[PDB]
């Protein structure tokens, strides 16, 4: 069928009160919910690796990718904190630590952070040099970049940056930090793998700059927008520093 | 009452308003969750109304009751 | 026509064939009579044509999963009162063809399949042994 069979797998996220089984034990209601969330995430990040799923979820109609972005712009701190994990592992980005300050979660996503493989017993120097030192290829295609660029373009077309901005401003701090870091990672990926026409107007961020410069809205939104811009600049500096 | 021509006119407006497309996020979520069963149930009801046979209405009512029990929780 | 008659007429009062979709093909035994020269089915002991369609309509109603306890109890009482109505293989063929074309739940399906468990089906075995040698 058209829009009712494959789009069922993202019902646990789009339906705030989702009941999968008609008759289940009333004792387990939160563990069942977490299991549903985990299975739906594992299915959603598995349909975006195939072309028949990418094309069928991003159809120009009332697709299932716009219903996934639209529920991200609703202040529900349970679905909103679970969609960010799917967005993080769709783009193969590392998750920061669960904190409320940006300067602590920015340190956990450092490309040069210590790993267990770099110990003398495991991988002393050879494994460490692989992570921090770059590959010798400067013109190889690297199909991974092709796939990530296609996915990022498909997500930007359906208004992902506006949803991320709305999550950054009108939400809690635990989720604001994670959405700011995701926005920084996506903005860095844009100016690296996207063609110039696709990424020459993304760095303007109109919906966030017009909020950080409007003195008619309440002052809390303006100040948190300015703080988000400052954190984005800090993330860009961290990215242009490099792994040490 | 064994009134099939009553339940038909009771639940036909629902299928009618459901085939004009969901317009909100709640309606889209409902169409993603329960939308598949409510189409095969209508297909079975139509197959029954074409050729009268309770063997075709029993499956439609199976689907309807499953959807009802999932909604009522 | 019987499904509407059973609404107002009870079982004990009506006591004072029934296979709808039964043909030579799609029957466990009847298919053999022409191909393998099976001897025709024997005459059972109108006293049994009624219980046949009764158990058929019961197993049909058991498919909607609306009220399974009542129909399960009815089937249990029919098995208790007349343990010989579950012996004709031309009824097991019909209920299996019905299981193969409807949506039964797993416990209801297991119960239906288990109703016909402690059965003998002696005539088919005898005819198979006769056509063998
Ligand atoms: Zn037969």
Curated annotation (Swiss-Prot), chain A:
It comes from the Eukaryota. There is a cross-link at residue 30 (Glycyl lysine isopeptide (Lys-Gly) (interchain with G-Cter in ubiquitin)). It is found in: Cell membrane; Endoplasmic reticulum membrane; Lysosome membrane. Phosphorylated by MTOR; when part of mTORC2. Ubiquitinated by the SCF(FBXW7) complex, leading to its degradation by the proteasome. Deubiquitinated by USP9X; deubiquitination stabilizes RICTOR and enhances its binding to MTOR, thus promoting mTORC2 complex assembly. The modification Phosphoserine is found at residue 21. Disulfide bonds: none annotated. Component of the mechanistic target of rapamycin complex 2 (mTORC2), consisting in two heterotretramers composed of MTOR, MLST8, RICTOR and MAPKAP1/SIN1. The mTORC2 core complex associates with PRR5/PROTOR1 and/or PRR5L/PROTOR2. Contrary to mTORC1, mTORC2 does not bind to and is not sensitive to FKBP12-rapamycin. Binds directly to MTOR and PRR5 within the TORC2 complex; interaction with MTOR is enhanced by deubiquitination of RICTOR by USP9X. Interaction with MAPKAP1 is not enhanced by RICTOR deubiquitination by USP9X. Interacts with CCDC28B. Interacts with NBN. Interacts with SIK3. (Microbial infection) Interacts with vaccinia virus protein F17; this interaction dysregulates MTOR. Component of the mechanistic target of rapamycin complex 2 (mTORC2), which transduces signals from growth factors to pathways involved in proliferation, cytoskeletal organization, lipogenesis and anabolic output. In response to growth factors, mTORC2 phosphorylates and activates AGC protein kinase family members, including AKT (AKT1, AKT2 and AKT3), PKC (PRKCA, PRKCB and PRKCE) and SGK1. In contrast to mTORC1, mTORC2 is nutrient-insensitive. Within the mTORC2 complex, RICTOR probably acts as a molecular adapter. RICTOR is responsible for the FKBP12-rapamycin-insensitivity of mTORC2. Belongs to the RICTOR family. This is Rapamycin-insensitive companion of mTOR. It comes from Homo sapiens. The chain holds residues 245 to 488 of 1708 of the full protein.
UniProtKB/Swiss-Prot annotation, chain B:
It is found in: Lysosome membrane; Endoplasmic reticulum membrane; Golgi apparatus membrane; Cell membrane. Expressed in numerous tissues, with highest levels in testis. Changing residue 26 to R: Complete loss ubiquitination by the SCF(FBXO22) complex. Autophosphorylates when part of mTORC1 or mTORC2. Phosphorylation in the kinase domain modulates the interactions of MTOR with RPTOR and AKT1S1/PRAS40 and leads to increased intrinsic mTORC1 kinase activity. Ubiquitinated at Lys-26 by the SCF(FBXO22) complex via 'Lys-27'-linked ubiquitination prevents mTORC1 substrate recruitment. It comes from the Eukaryota. Disulfide bonds: none annotated. There is a cross-link at residue 26 (Glycyl lysine isopeptide (Lys-Gly) (interchain with G-Cter in ubiquitin)). Signal peptide: none annotated. Serine/threonine protein kinase which is a central regulator of cellular metabolism, growth and survival in response to hormones, growth factors, nutrients, energy and stress signals. MTOR directly or indirectly regulates the phosphorylation of at least 800 proteins. Functions as part of 2 structurally and functionally distinct signaling complexes mTORC1 and mTORC2 (mTOR complex 1 and 2). Belongs to the PI3/PI4-kinase family. Part of the mechanistic target of rapamycin complex 1 (mTORC1) which contains MTOR, MLST8 and RPTOR. The mTORC1 complex is a 1 Md obligate dimer of two stoichiometric heterotetramers with overall dimensions of 290 A x 210 A x 135 A. It has a rhomboid shape and a central cavity, the dimeric interfaces are formed by interlocking interactions between the two MTOR and the two RPTOR subunits. The kinase domain (PI3K/PI4K) is intrinsically active but has a highly restricted catalytic center. The FAT domain forms three discontinuous subdomains of alpha-helical TPR repeats plus a single subdomain of HEAT repeats. The four domains pack sequentially to form a C-shaped a-solenoid that clamps onto the kinase domain. It is linked to Smith-Kingsmore syndrome: An autosomal dominant syndrome characterized by intellectual disability, macrocephaly, seizures, umbilical hernia, and facial dysmorphic features. Focal cortical dysplasia 2: A form of focal cortical dysplasia, a malformation of cortical development that results in medically refractory epilepsy in the pediatric population and in adults. FCORD2 is a severe form, with onset usually in childhood, characterized by disrupted cortical lamination and specific cytological abnormalities. It is classified in 2 subtypes: type IIA characterized by dysmorphic neurons and lack of balloon cells; type IIB with dysmorphic neurons and balloon cells. This is Serine/threonine-protein kinase mTOR. The gene is MTOR.
